[PDB]
Amino acid sequence: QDINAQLTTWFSQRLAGFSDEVVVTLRSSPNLLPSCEQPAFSMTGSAKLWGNVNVVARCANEKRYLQVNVQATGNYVAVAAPIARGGKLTPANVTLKRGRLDQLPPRTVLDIRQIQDAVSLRDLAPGQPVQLTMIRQAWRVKAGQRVQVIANGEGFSVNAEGQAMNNAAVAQNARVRMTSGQIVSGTVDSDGNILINL
């Protein structure tokens, strides 16, 4: 049962800020588990946060692939009052509701800061989870603008300047041409700054 406890803790920590209740269950055979007592878990795979995922369990040069099931409960953005097509999304129209993140439809908005100055693409009814496929977010960053790039690491932080190379909404990927001429890539935050996680 200790392996589930490790995964539950590893995922709870990874899902900090998103979920307040995480439960993880191993699907692959425990015989295929690596020799170490505490394997190092790495998500060197696609960007899927929860559900049924593949976790790399490293055991000092010994590599293993574990199939796991991640259940997550937290906040997401839901429609609170009917929104007309072309209608703006506001705090009076949408609200945060608590539910199972793993059960939500794809590309569901979790943070209210994402839908600043956003318009509906279709008719929306109360209770419906806000999906990115059903809205048009305003650009937080515009191509050609100078932006601040903030890179954080373990005991290591970098602040630098560049020019945005593409239009991007809050929480979307932004490519930035640094003064040195180099291209970097990060996530647009609410403040319009570019965050790079190293």
Q: Do the strands 118-120 and 194-197 form a parallel or antiparallel pair, or are they unpaired? A: unpaired
Tell me, rounded to whole angstroms, the distance of Cα 52 from its chain centroid: 16
DSSP E strands, 27-182: 40-42, 51-58, 65-79, 88-89, 94-100, 118-120, 135-136, 146-153, 156-164, 173-178
Which residues in 29-46 are b (16+ Cβ under 10 Å) and which e?
eeeeebeeeebebeeeee
Query: What element of type H or E holds 3?
Result: helix 2-14
Nearest to 90 by CA among 116, 111, 71: 116
Cα torsion angle, 100, 102, 108, 109, sign: positive
Resolution (Å) of this entry: 2.3
Ranges of each domain in the chain: 1-138, 139-198
Q: Quickly name the fold that domain 139-198 has.
A: SH3 type barrels. (2.30.30)
Q: What technique determined this structure?
A: X-ray
- The radius of gyration of the chain's CA atoms, rounded to the nearest angstrom, is 20
Give bridge partners of residue 176 from the DSSP assignment. 164, 184
Give bridge partners of residue 40 from the DSSP assignment. 58
